[PDB]
Amino acid sequence: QIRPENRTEEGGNYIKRCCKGFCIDILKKIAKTVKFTYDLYLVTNGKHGKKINGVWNGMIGEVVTKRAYMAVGSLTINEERSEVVDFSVPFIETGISVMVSRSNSAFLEPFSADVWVMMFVMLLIVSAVAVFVSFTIGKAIWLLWGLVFNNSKIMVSVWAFFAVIFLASYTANLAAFMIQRRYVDQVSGLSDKKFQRPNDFSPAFRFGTVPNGSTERNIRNNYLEMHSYMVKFNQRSVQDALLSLKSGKLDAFIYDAAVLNYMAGRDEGCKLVTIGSGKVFATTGYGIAIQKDSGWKRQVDLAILQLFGDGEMEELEALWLTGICHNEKNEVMSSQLDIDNMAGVFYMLAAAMALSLITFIMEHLFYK
Amino acid sequence: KAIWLLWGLVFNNTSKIMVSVWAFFAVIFLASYTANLAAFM
Amino acid sequence: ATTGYGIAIQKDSGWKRQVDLAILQLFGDGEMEELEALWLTGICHNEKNFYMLAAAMALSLITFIMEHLFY
Amino acid sequence: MWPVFHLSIVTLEEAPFVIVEDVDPLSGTCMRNTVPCRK
Amino acid sequence: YVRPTTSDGTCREEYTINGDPIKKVICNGPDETIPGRPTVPQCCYGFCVDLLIKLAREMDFTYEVHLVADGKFGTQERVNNSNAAAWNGMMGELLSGQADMIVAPLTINNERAQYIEFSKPFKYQGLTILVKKEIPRSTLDSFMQPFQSTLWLLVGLSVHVVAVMLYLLDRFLSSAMWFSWRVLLSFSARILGMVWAGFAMIIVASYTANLAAFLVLRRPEERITGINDPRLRNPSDKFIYATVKQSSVDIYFRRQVELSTMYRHMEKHNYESAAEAIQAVRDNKLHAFIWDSAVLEFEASQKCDLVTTGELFFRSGFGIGMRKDSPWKQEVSLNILKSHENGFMEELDKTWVRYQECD
Amino acid sequence: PFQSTLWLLVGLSVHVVAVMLYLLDSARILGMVWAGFAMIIVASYTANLAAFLVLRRPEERITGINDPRLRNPSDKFIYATVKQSSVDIYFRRQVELSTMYRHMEKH
């Protein structure tokens, strides 16, 4: 029903639409088991709704107003709503989660640090055999490491061949391991603080969510400053948020886990992904809003658990939920040429040089 | 001896700078060609 | 020969046309695809997987003779 | 019970299409989608 | 976790890897150590114990905890009577009045929900198949081999030929041979050396192609490709999959006629406890073991030789068992909801689920 | 994709290494670490080749009959078939593919 557009009765005339989907088919299956006829309507005020200045809105408000006995949809379940109204057994797991896109130490990983120690000990024995055959020993180790990177005579020749083979093998295995890499993400445990403190990262991280939503209420509940910062970052809709993500106007998006996951699976090209490899916060379920304790209740719950018992939920998830990005067969992508991991290994490489400088200074100290 | 030096740098073993750039380019070209040959094979 | 498995019967069998209609019912409904998916499915879709130098050496010998000519 | 009362069906074992198993001594009869057959 | 107390009766002090002392509570129950099965006091501690303690903190009610006698979660059956069937397990303990509440990972299902009420799920989880994982250490000396050694020796012969060609070209000795062997590891002299260098580089590139080809192994499409797999669907005598008898998994497999074949395959190899089945899977006695993902993923994290199969099936949850006639389930479900809302469950999961680095 | 920032950081690292060489003029250990870093750099240069070689992320919008895009039709992806054909009879037979048939009916 809409107030501004009126053919007659001034708000009495209502527009008819066709609703269908996962939650719809679930509601039909449940209504099939419970065997009651029903009349479906759409909420004109807000999408989901929240409590402002002491007043409920949306579907919950329609339930408080007795305009609807049972509310079905993408509505999440939280502590505040469950007190006043009853919720059915959770249909699917959904909650506050972050969707992001990643743009981009493997060198030391391929050696597992064992190859380095083994080659160092073997080079020490070979350099001892070569020395048997002060700065001269340093030049011997310089020769060994010189062979290691590929820039008495027989031993050095065989050692050079083995070092060359080891180098080629190391190169092929490092390339293969670099190609086989995956799972790369940010904020594995959400405790990374990137989203927490904007000023810790320069430039500050831009993140927001759809206002008046459950994720927004939970966001204001757990974190005050996060709510204050994401207040200006609030997005009109999930589509506008996805566009803000794609065009670069937003770094990370905070939304429902199931919605974000379907959006990930049904994503063309599979550009955007969930954080923590499907990691969700608050771990809420999708229920069904209902009336005061007296009602169908346990019958509805038994019907949902029956729906889970038959296994039709898996098929429903296959049709309406599952995406083509699950077909990825474990590892999702290559990450291609851009790495920045080599820059990470550069620090480890530099550290041994700094320690060698410390040893040089320590040798200079013993001299003086 | 110049061509011998150039081809010597091309394969795994003002003048110095040019020889250096040529050696780097030869290393990149050799590694890329070998890795790509392994991958294509 | 692109042969297939039918169901053998006696000649002029009346149960022929019915059986044919049911088999075609399995393909029309698409239940044949699901049944074949169930029983015929398998685990592995895919798995597993000097002369020029000597020529260059001979060319190098001819290069020795040619260098002798060039010298 | 004797099967004589029909369209008697004779078959032959070829995998995966035709799979023949021994009848369960504990069950006493066939179970699930398995069907009784005589040879 | 359940562990026997010291002779003094005091519970042993332990702490999490995070440096946090682990809370413990007293529970009287059957010990698997003793020949008989009398219920004895033992210290029990874990996610469920911490949850019950936190519930007792939020709600003023105290708690007396004890282990179930049969050692199974719950089931509905009658041994000696065809007429009427009765519950056994913790569910039976709840319906008999032996316990006013059951705090444990009890899977929510329609069969159990009839007689008893379930609190809002504290943990969302499903069933996944767990199989043994092995680190493919091999080819070390054998991928030294795969060149067949005929090609490398042929490389040496090519080095000899290059040295002979070098002598012939230089004419148009020992030091030159040593220089040739070193290069391995007139116009035609330089041509021979250049061809030798190119052939050596090509040999290294071929060794890298062979190495890279040899590293990729076992192919895709592992033993378990999901809930539905030919190895899972058709119970070959080689591959044995099982589950714990008289459990929710058992009821789930025995419920469907489609899974009746899987039930026939599991019925013989089934175990009473999940620990013996896990130990069997680790020792490769049992090929695959289907169970809760909450326990399975935790075991896969704990031991790296065990991996859980993908495509999680049977989405469900764990909740505190309550009688419908008891007023505590309202505030209990509310408290679990607030527990998820505040993020306490996040810290609890970060606590009891370790996710080791497998050093 | 190196952004030329990494290459410039490399050149700056070369200037810094030259400055450290001048200043130094136990250094052999540092030179050895430099050699290992060089080998890692060459292996990484091979890794870039392997990366351009991979091309491991196809989208595959349409996989099969049970594919998500086909099972759940979207306004972006338009699938159709030949009217008055076996496809029409096959799609109209099943109620599950009846929606996909409704999706095809316009297209």
Ligand SMILES: N[C@]1(C(=O)O)C[C@@H](C(=O)O)C1
């Ligand atoms: N499901 C939501 C809710 O309010 O219930 C909408 C969504 C969001 O905006 O992130 C949470």
